[PDB]
Design a protein around this ligand. Structure first.
Ligand SMILES: Nc1ncnc2c1ncn2[C@@H]1O[C@H](COP(=O)(O)OP(=O)(O)NP(=O)(O)O)[C@@H](O)[C@H]1O
Ligand SMILES: [Mg+2]
Length: 508
RNA sequence: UUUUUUU
């Protein structure tokens, strides 16, 4: 199917809620709901996508727009309009299915739908139910039955579960499917699930196998995504609506980016602690930040350090995939409203999450995929606000920074070195209450994580892996110490006859 | 159990 580009245009006639009302694109009832939110105007991606999504043409839509610029309402608005346009047809049936890569993002999109309901009660007849893992399955189905929603928001795993059992009852009249964070949902480990989802919806559809229109949204998207989505795009033509120049970097230009380079991976912990201390002092504790880490075990370790240093000054919140889902949801709600605090998380929080007035995004080590650099920093400087980001890495991670330049055109102007004083090392280390076995587990999680991105970030294995491993000795304040391990363990890893392996581990 | 993602 042919791709039709509509590139970023410089002198374009401004589209408004009023102009779309006058033109008959938007009904009064949705116009009213969005007007009462009192936004200055529609964001560029909203201006670009609303009419073409609702167009009577037989096309799919791909939309790219920078982090924090209103992609959610860019699809919710025309979805509501479609529901209004077809209000007498299949009114108890799901007409729009929106898929997201994390449960908390699916739940956020649902909350955005509820904000539309709150601004115009006449829209509550277009009901919405979220289908996400870690929630009571029966309770969500009671809700599907009671509310008979026209909009479903879901994560892939739970959506497949529901579809295998109830696709005939609720899903035979779907007209739109939305992949939010589309590039992520078409990576390995989501792509097959999206194909399963798309195949069921298409098979069960009462009109035809190609009825459903597909909408892809992300801040990080190109032509190569259309190829990946080939098996889920039904239509003969695909509009690529772009609000970013072809060569322009995808990172939001308002973010003040920097990188802090240490000699050792572990030193990035000390750099971050000293940075946060300074910010809490200089801002008089008026500090809201997000700090990203590579693994769940390390995230949790970092939280302990930051509670010991900073719990007297600011709340410290722990956010990753092993936090129970009830607590994930309650901490998201709190961090959205709070003026200050530090959210310490994995890439569970890299994409989509909208926490207002975050001042800074910090990163210890590299993200789980190159694109997530852009999404991580995009947690700040949202909806016209300012923001900064700091990447804390060691020397042996520098090829990541070069890869950002070569692959994504991101050049970080502010780069500086860091060397920890002996006093910061003593201060941080003394409060560490973890047993050596716990420290081994933590460092081992980092080894596995870094191993998996050696190729994509162009790391030198013989340097990055011994440096990560040496974190164990640093944290135990004895840099001669290697990680005690068994032969069978080393065999499983693949480093049993390697000098790299001998530099990292002691067969004990 | 290396980030998520039904159970
Ligand atoms: N027209 C508008 N004017 C001002 N703010 C808006 C407008 N539309 C949406 N917002 C707000 O902008 C914030 C971010 O919107 P959101 O839809 O989460 O951005 P996004 O493009 O999806 N970002 P990301 O998922 O990080 O790539 C939310 O708090 C919205 O309430
Ligand atoms: Mg979004």
């Amino acid at each position: 199917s042919k791709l039709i580009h509509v590139p970023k245009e410089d002198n374009s006639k401004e589209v408004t809620l009023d102009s779309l009302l006058e033109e008959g694109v938007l009904d009064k009832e949705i116009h009213k709901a969005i007007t009462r939110m009192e936004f200055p105007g529609l964001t560029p991606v909203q201006q670009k996508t609303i009419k073409p999504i609702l167009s009577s043409e037989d096309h799919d839509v791909i939309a790219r727009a920078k982090t924090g610029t209103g992609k959610t309402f860019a699809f919710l608005i025309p979805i509501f309009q479609h529901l209004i346009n077809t209000k007498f047809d299949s009114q108890y049936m799901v007409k729009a299915v929106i898929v997201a890569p994390t449960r908390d993002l699916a739940l956020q999109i649902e909350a955005e739908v509820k904000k539309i309901h709150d601004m115009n009660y006449g829209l509550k007849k277009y009901a919405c139910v979220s289908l996400v893992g870690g929630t009571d399955f029966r309770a969500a189905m009671n809700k599907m039955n009671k509310l008979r929603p026209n909009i479903v928001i879901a994560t892939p795993g739970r959506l497949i579960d529901v579809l295998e059992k109830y696709s005939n009852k609720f899903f035979r009249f779907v007209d739109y499917k939305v992949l939010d964070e589309a590039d992520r949902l078409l990576e390995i480990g989501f792509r097959d699930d999206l194909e399963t989802i798309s195949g069921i919806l298409n098979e069960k559809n009462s009109k035809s196998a190609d009825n459903i229109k597909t909408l892809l949204f992300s801040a990080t998207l190109d032509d190569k995504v259309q190829k990946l989505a080939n098996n889920i795009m039904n239509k003969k033509e695909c509009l690529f609506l772009d609000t970013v120049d072809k060569n322009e970097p995808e990172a939001h230009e308002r973010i003040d980016q920097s990188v802090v380079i240490s000699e050792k991976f572990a030193n990035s912990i000390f750099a971050a602690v000293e940075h946060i201390k300074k910010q809490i002092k200089e801002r008089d504790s008026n500090y809201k930040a997000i700090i990203f880490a590579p693994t769940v075990k390390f995230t949790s370790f970092l939280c302990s350090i930051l509670k010991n240093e900073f719990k007297k000054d600011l709340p410290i919140l722990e956010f990753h995939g092993k936090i129970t889902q009830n607590k994930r949801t309650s901490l998201v709600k709190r961090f959205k409203k709070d003026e200050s605090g530090i959210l310490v998380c994995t890439d569970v929080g890299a994409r989509g999450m909208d926490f207002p007035n975050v001042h800074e995004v910090l990163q210890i080590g590299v993200p789980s995929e190159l694109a997530n650099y852009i999404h991580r920093i995009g947690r700040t400087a949202r909806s016209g606000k300012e923001g900064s980001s700091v990447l804390f890495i060691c020397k042996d991670e520098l090829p990541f920074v070069r890869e950002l330049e070569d692959a994504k055109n991101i050049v970080i102007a502010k780069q500086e070195k860091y060397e920890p004083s002996e006093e910061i090392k003593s201060e941080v280390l003394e409060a560490v209450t973890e047993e050596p076995e716990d420290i081994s587990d933590i460092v081992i999680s980092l080894i596995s994580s870094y191993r998996s991105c050696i190729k994509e970030y162009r790391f030198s294995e013989r340097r990055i892996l011994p440096e990560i491993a040496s974190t164990y000795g640093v944290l135990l304040n004895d840099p001669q110490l290697k990680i005690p391990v068994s032969r069978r363990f080393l065999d499983k890893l693949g480093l049993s006859r390697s000098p790299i392996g001998k530099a990292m581990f002691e067969i004990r």
